[PDB]
Symmetry: D3
Subunit: 251 residues, 6 copies
């Protein structure tokens, strides 16, 4: 009942699909699938929940990666084994630039590699760059729904707290390497923090797979720390609409 | 009073009822299994890869919370549990052994980990040892002897990937980056017992923040003998390891 | 002069914000001549500067010389003078078997095998091209009808060992670069050149727009010696693409 | 002589598998005098070796000297002669306020601020002590009755800048080690010494058992100059522990 | 027409020359060659201008490298292919020590490797050290003409601005790695900044080629930043005389 | 005692600014006997110090022990006492086929395969010897008539794996040092030793003058086990050079 080690899927479950939308959150999988025609649940194992749906009369996979590069690396690899060639990540994000507001959508051209898993596919000098066609389709899709969009570099961290220079922690300390890091990234024009893009973009770009990255701004780190409960859902829906519309252009 | 005191786990400090020890499996589906071994098991929360149950061990509240696969999610789980008052962490996992003398069904207690991860660096520079707490290690080894098991104590390679970082070539690309080509043979020669995916992060982040951490895993595959685990030995080995981690939790209360 | 090396003042640029930046100083006149009202401005060391006009708007052409260090000087001083958009036109050796001599390559991002990029951002920062610039080049290549490949470029501080050439005085390559071409090939890296890592890193980390295009004059998997006819044809072919892309970014 | 430096043969050991390894060559005679039948074997360079008997079994005491390089020579050459267990006895400077002068510290693993450890295993490999050896040292400390702390040790390749001492000739510390003592302090690192990182890495990566114990003769958060009496008392206190631990490991 | 890819020279052009003076400025080539016997233009391609001359009856090459290790590495390699075994660099420099004045001559024993190209010949732990016979000849030549000489370590940077900790720039920022780096080098006894020596000295010392390095101080970083034009040419003339005199001793 | 380890006062030195620093503590008497008025000062741990007179001027001889760590302690504490010039005399294993046993090697700079040098300057800083010291050593070698080679030395933090010795307990060499000897050989590195990188880095970055001279007792390309008598005469040859060089520097 499975051709892969973790996902619990066969090549036949995919029905010829070559594109997958890959959110971090397993609870978001159904929401993205519901936007497309005839969505069905295929599998749920660990943090990997998979749905299949129809878009413009063509099968599309939605599969969760979980938080971080390691589980992303498993999901992407096993989906690649199953036949997926195009990967579109839909994420949540904390912006670090003052001109970016909550509700804005960010398209990532390339990522700052603050992760470990990217190194298991390519040395640090290799750019965690997004596929040009995927990035184009995400930019086009953002205009299609009519959102406020920023395009640029993302800092992709193996941690939510110290690697994003959060001090509201148990220890209250940040290791020397990351002390003052946010200010450095800010000055370099880095838009935001998330936790999967570096791994995803590196492993795909170094293995002949197409990858795109899009995220909804939940919090801006220069104005607030605790997100709003209602705005969180609206921003998520906005970006989910874009990732589906982008997939339409890449079929 | 409350609904959630942390960003991800969906738990309040009040939910924990004074608990200071947590058992941290990778698989969210393993949480109920561990909690079923103790008294009064109750489901607290399920969000993302983080499933949390509360149980009673010798009259003392204990938490079971899944980390998910890998350092990044593990770092969120551990930090947010520490915010809620957890001081002791015991990881129970699955693992592939790389030494010929270690058989499937054996139990491995980790003294310290080879840091093939990225998250550990976010707490301490690479030179800092990813070392388990001595009292936690003692308890796990003592628990393994108590219920009876084939035990090996030593070093674990903790990788940020399942595939290339553990030198698996049966993949889509069929290639392994230069840095990891020939790496398994090197760890083997250095006496490293096994591969898993969370210990380097867990052990580094706890040892560098005044928290106690222990690491135990049941070997379900030996890399010199096979690649695919048996879907029965898997269940028995997990049951074996789950019994050991609860018994080690008893000694640390 | 307003700057240390270029021998240019702010007035010389006449409000220009876009520069085409070849490596070869002899290419500067060739690029300028394709545009309206081409005028020489200055020549000091490897930095030759011309000013021209594209659709009524002033544009700068300025040579960087070979390598990140002189590129970093040229880009920094042009930025000081008001340039915000940088389009590099270069020559390259392809390392993929499917890429032909005469093909044009558009760089999305570069493998940083250089030193100068590190003086602007740590290695983990991507040497990524600006999205608008890359789009302009891809559209400009599609307009003239060239065979175009889009992807990653290996940018080396060295022509020989860093590109794993063994036809050298020593005949040796340092451990770090031994087998490196094979690695890049497997990773889908299209080609080797010598300036893009520095240019892309320094621009992306300072709020400057940069694009990178190159004509293939050699494929490393078939032959090493470039033909003394295709070289001029490929250069002029890629020069037309960069000028047309500049038209879209004004 | 079967070895390059120590000046010992396989027969000189008489089947010994355990060795106590102090840094100070003047401490070898002190440790061996506490065991039955002490015999001087060889003294070459900084390596002094004494043979003793513990519970009717031959035990070796051999000085490593200060630092990883000679520790690597000593351990390797003793291993060639049949030694499978290494117990290090040293002095240390504590960096935690709750640890006092006179206290005994058992090292679980070490921060690798050394070079020699890299010659055996890459930095990511933990400089971790053998679990059985650590157990014995902790149990031996409880046996004699002493205030014991168990945890991490910073093992520096230098006495001054690597341990962030500013009372030096230059009065400066290199950028890399600036503010490093506070970093280790916040990370719960107990102390500074100069041999454990090399010893623990080279043993754990070669199937050899290694244990590490030290007496606190200075506390870095209060006073720099140690007392010329309490030093000897602490040294003699720690020696009793390492001999008692050696009994449990034979 | 050419035996090499860039320089535009054949072996015959060199006429058996084994020594080359290598300035950074292509315009310095004729000026250096004019101080010797029978000066002749050989080639000019890109930043590489080559002249041939005679010194005590022996053919000597003068060839420009351009700014930085990359073009230096090309020139030196191709000169080596054509038969050059001894390389003497004469350049300009900015001193970072208060006791070194404008107009002073500096002879480099070894260089701090703040470049990329040196790594393409030897790992960072390999010393960017000058040849003993070349260093001796330069020190002896400087004392022979009567100049204020300083011998020691040079910081060799792939960048003129941030890597030499200049803040008078478009961004006005310096990356963390190089923040406070000048003060570190100053305290370590480093004399000066230039842009080619690390590459030249590393590539020669690891390939069995002799290399020496000499430079004229035109700016002191602890004092003024704007150099005098008349003083610049005079300082260049002083250093050019020393390097030709040093070449005499090495033939 | 004004120092922590050496057990020496500023008055014990009698205003000496130069010190010859061997690795072996038994060689300290040998060098001191070559000069006028040999007097023993102190012997603690691996550090033995002897005072002598050269040309009517006081000169110190102090053992560093094997490796960077104790070398850094010795050199720092001697600098505190007033020593500004450090001349190292050691033994070495040559890795070039043209260098024979009995030859003398003067080190211009060292490959930094140590850890202690990093505690004074980052890896990019060259472990370079002082020009005057190097000049004095070369001139002294020609004065007494010895077969001399001048160049780069590999300075390792270990005797075995870092010098790619496979005749060990494990018989393995870590990936980093696998094939490393061949690399150094192609790069023209003359030899292996264990102190120069630390000595040359810590001195060149602190304003202290340092020189390095060594006697070839083995060549790695031919055989491993050296002759006994040849080892003694090579030591005496090198010691004669370092004393003659010290005469020029005072
Ligand atoms: O600041 C952030 N950093 C991130 O890495 N991120 C991506 O999702 C990571 C797991 O929530 C999302 C945000 Se936004 C946020 C702020 C506070 C609480 C939850 C999410
Ligand atoms: O080889 C391993 N490496 C690991 O890192 N590991 C830990 O669990 C990671 C998620 O399955 C578990 C094993 Se065992 C095994 C082999 C093949 C398929 C599943 C599990
Ligand atoms: O293989 C190459 N690598 C490059 O870095 N490159 C860019 O121009 C660098 C200066 O010629 C150009 C080529 Se193509 C070539 C092959 C042989 C001779 C000259 C150019
Ligand atoms: O602070 C220390 N750091 C160490 O590395 N250490 C171990 O012994 C190394 C040789 O003295 C011992 C001490 Se304690 C001490 C303080 C002052 C003088 C000698 C020892
Ligand atoms: O500070 C310096 N750093 C250098 O690397 N340098 C060498 O020439 C590099 C190209 O100008 C020369 C100087 Se001096 C100087 C100061 C200001 C403007 C031009 C030259
Ligand atoms: O190969 C060598 N490597 C070295 O680092 N070296 C310097 O002395 C180190 C301590 O003996 C000396 C030699 Se030569 C020698 C060969 C065999 C046994 C002793 C010395
Ligand atoms: K995860
Ligand atoms: K020593
Ligand atoms: K150049």
């Amino acid at each position: 009942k499975s051709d892969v080690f973790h996902l619990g899927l066969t090549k036949n479950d995919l029905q010829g699909a070559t594109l997958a939308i890959v959110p971090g959150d397993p609870d978001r999988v159904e929401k993205i699938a519901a936007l497309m025609d005839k969505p069905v649940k295929l599998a749920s194992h660990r943090e990997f929940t998979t749905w299949r749906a129809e878009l413009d009369g063509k099968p599309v996979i939605v599969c969760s990666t979980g938080i971080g590069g390691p589980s992303t690396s498993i999901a992407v690899e096993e989906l690649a084994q199953l036949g997926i060639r195009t990967f579109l990540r839909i994420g949540t994000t904390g912006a670090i630039q003052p001109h970016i507001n909550v509700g804005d959508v960010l398209v990532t051209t390339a990522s700052v590699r603050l992760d470990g898993a990217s190194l298991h596919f390519a040395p640090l000098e290799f750019p965690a760059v997004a596929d040009f066609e995927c990035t184009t389709a995400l930019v086009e899709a953002a205009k299609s729904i009519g959102a406020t969009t920023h395009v640029g570099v993302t800092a992709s961290s193996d941690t939510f707290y110290p690697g994003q220079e959060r001090y509201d922690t148990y220890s209250g300390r940040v290791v020397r390497h990351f002390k003052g890091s946010m200010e450095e990234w800010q000055a370099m024009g880095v838009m935001n923090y998330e936790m999967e893009s570096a791994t995803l973009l590196t492993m795909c770009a170094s293995q002949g797979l197409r990858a795109g990255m899009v995220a909804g701004v939940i919090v801006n780190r220069t104005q607030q720390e605790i997100p709003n409960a209602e705005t969180m859902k609206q921003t998520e829906s906005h970006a989910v609409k874009i990732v589906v519309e982008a997939a339409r252009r890449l079929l």
